[PDB]
């Protein structure tokens, strides 16, 4: 019921057709890991694969690897404090967590021979037989962490920090983002229930309240992430770039910024294939745009010809067919989001995911809101354009079988359907995968059985759940005025999602390779664009749905005021939160000072000043006469006093 | 025709009534300067004053003071490079400019006994007799710098950098701002002449062109000021705070950020008197607002009753009376801007001027544009409100002596009057002060005569001319669509102002005390607010003056589009100028690395890994049996190879 001290496990699938190649690749593989010091053990595997097992035998090699990497961060402004002990006295001062151990094991299996490692990245030239490298999961800790989280109402700061200790900094930021979003969701939750009782449908004051809250939360989290990165000491790691393993280069570069020549790729080949997203996004506009308008017009056509024999669940049934249908059609578009992104050669693995997301978000931006956008910005202001699409469907239904009444209250029903049915099918997909999983020395067989299962588990992507919580922010920031129970219905989800995603890392995936990132990433832009867009369409909805024919005086002012209510209250909160004097920033200017105070500690009056007058009076004697005779006029300071006093009475005589 | 090596000159006016006090103060003063090492010479003065003359005699004291201050900056991240030589080998590597010399002389006369100086700040408790401390001006360099500038068409980067060498960094930023504003003025200058020929009055395309240029200039200067601060090595000096001499404190503070206890002032007493500006600004609103409406209504009343017997110069004569009258009434309001600011106890001398300016700018914001604002936002859209003020003046003129026709083209005449007549009276005031100035050992009398004049000169404030060039940007960013020759008429001024202000430091003022500031200061906000406000009222003017009755569809869209044309092109240029890879930033990451590479240089394979297996096999022998017998199953890596190969054929047998 425990591990055997193993750090990482390499899969190395061996097929039948490339048998002699994979066998010769294996002995070349197992040679390479032994040079960098990995104590190696080979075990059996399923589908005729060979799971080799690695660990660091020599601690003083391993502590030197810790001492090398801690020196490597200290050069880049990551660590303010120097190690100062070339022998392991620095390591006894600051001990290695299990995250900092496993990364430096993973660096010794991935870094090339330039950086002192055996690079066994699978996507490079040979070893296409190595399928995956993974650390084994500790089920002993894992059972406690679920149990201790499931009994807890709230999550303390020591609960989030324990995730950093064993799962890395990038995984711990997702729970630290979620917890600080779960807590900040209660403010439009409770006020979204009070606006349901008091204010009624489409109030103006809730839109100004939500557009205030979405600034206050987002500016608070940007302050909180620079405090947490100080606390884990990962502040500034985004400034470090790490080169990509599968990055291809045409030539090496000269005149570098770091100083040593780097391998580069001419951007005219990259800006060609980056321009390929412009027809790809525009086709995906008219893919999803034609898809919504053929479901939305058909849905409004069916309530006119059947007159609703069932209830309103039957009236919106293709819209329900869209929400159960969208996580499939998001799956095919994320595949084209990743193939188009890997085709573009990106330099760093930070700037590779920094442009994956702004392709991944915009594609998810279309498929999650343009169904709602067509209700409140096409159907409500002018449904006269869809009247060709209605009678076109009337041409079929008469041949098949052998008065528009545009309701302003359609979106509040539609926002209700996008809220709960997406929350059902999400919690359906977070319950069905729990329900779809449900020789050799005769001692480690149960140990080996959990490993043989763990290769079948997929990797856990942290970005796959940021994209949900950002899209969950989009319903609250933009369209929550249509149904202010959404912030009430998201808050019950974010409690269980904080324990559902804790369960998803627990049993439905292997342990991720621990990484280091300062911020959440490029989501801080996508959380900020949704906040600003949640000022315009939060005000433009409450003007239309609360509607006299609609005047452009009314819309263009209600947009301009609330969008400039945003920019004022953005500058107020940025002013206020600058003056909160965060404890992560007080310590950083402090602890930098004592290290300089260390080097500070590393390193008569009248009688002196006459001697340089004696010095210059020798040099006029050796060789001008205005300059020397000016200064030697009053030689000592006592001579300056008496002449200074006698010039007063000389003036006082006059 | 040269100085005598003197650094600073202290005035110390001695009156008749406090004669014995000032005389006893003088001997106490001249005692204090001799302790910190100032070689002292006393000379005569006018109005029965005693000009004492100071210099540093001992160079090794003075080099240690240089070595102390260079260490002081290096602790705060100012200097990337360490001095590394406690003896003066560091100083021979990087020599002292005359600016860095005079500041450290001035620090020894101002810093208290805590920081190792004799604080002789005049505004502290005793020595109210010391009037001013000033460095003497070098007329030898000064005659060359005017002559070499007056022949030059353009100013090279070595011309601006010479100002830093003798006048400090804060003075050199004003010319570096002016030169980079003079050069960026030619873009709406030439395009403002082409819009005069082609487009005519109040074009829309020029407003989008100017609102583009005002982002491109301002974002360029913000990039350029972090390059110049790197080049002078003053980058980050704003992060250093310097305490104020005249700051009063109630008690010392505990738990500090630097570590040592500081003297503080409870903010409830300061936020009381900071709230005093709210009635002060609102009264100055209705001071200047009532002042414009009683001149503007009277001016439009005089063209109706006299029918213009003279020409249009006679028609706008109270508006001309306002522009010749405003530098006087700006003088009285700047006095209340400085008395109200000094009454508020500010901590640092940086944050003292950082709130002086936003009082000084807003007060100058009212008196320079609200005359134009009432033309284009009250008179043009609805002049029906001023009709009481007309017939009120008609009640007087009939008793004195015993049909509105609102012209849309009034502002283009009025913008012409605010352009050239302000430029006349400015160049009048920059020519009239040149035209209003036009015993003792018998050797230094001509030397002493230039000093006796120089006490009568006032100090040169750098902020007094930033406020002009920011206000000059306000006419271009906001109201240049009314008269696009303004950018043509400002460009001829900014050439001569670049040599006029070079003349004003030359003869019409003493040499300023050299300081150190990273940016221009809080003008970067006031240049940025004017840029954003130059998007709204640059579009709202061209809608009204080019005008059918005016629809709120038209105004509210023309505001919303151009103001969102601003925020898009702000984010584009911030994206583009981030990717220009400025040479001031390439060197900073470079030169930081070699200093870390210095500390980097300050600090078998298979045969090792079996020994820890031999280590653990002794410890199972001393004492678990799954963990040990797993790892000692395949002891050496060659044993891992053969079992790893035989598991393949075992699988291949199956």
Numbering used by the authors:
A (entry chain B), B (entry chain A): 15 to 416, 425 to 460, 477 to 585, 595 to 650, 665 to 684, 688 to 718
Sentences from the paper on this structure:
The differences between structures of nhTMEM16 determined in detergents and in a lipid environment are most pronounced for the Ca2+-free state determined at 3.8 Å resolution. Whereas the structure in detergent displays a Ca2+-free conformation where the subunit cavity remains open to the membrane, the same region has changed its accessibility in the nanodisc sample. Here, the movement of α4 leads to a shielding of the cavity from the membrane core, resembling a conformation observed in the ion channel TMEM16A. This movement is accompanied by a conformational change of α6 as a consequence of the repulsion of negatively charged residues in the empty Ca2+-binding site. Generally, the Ca2+-free state of nhTMEM16 in nanodiscs is very similar to equivalent structures of its close homologs afTMEM16, TMEM16K and the more distantly related scramblase TMEM16F, thus underlining that all structures represent inactive conformations of the scramblase in the absence of ligand. Here, the Ca2+-free conformation obtained in nanodiscs defines a non-conductive state of the protein, where the polar subunit cavity is shielded from the membrane by tight interactions of α4 and α6 on the extracellular part of the membrane. The protein surface of the closed subunit cavity is hydrophobic as expected for a membrane protein. In this conformation, the Ca2+-binding site is empty, with the intracellular part of α6 positioned apart from the remainder of the binding site to release the electrostatic strain induced by the large negative net-charge in this region. Details of the conformation of α6 in the absence of Ca2+ differ between the family members of known structure with the conformation in nhTMEM16 being close to the one observed for TMEM16F.
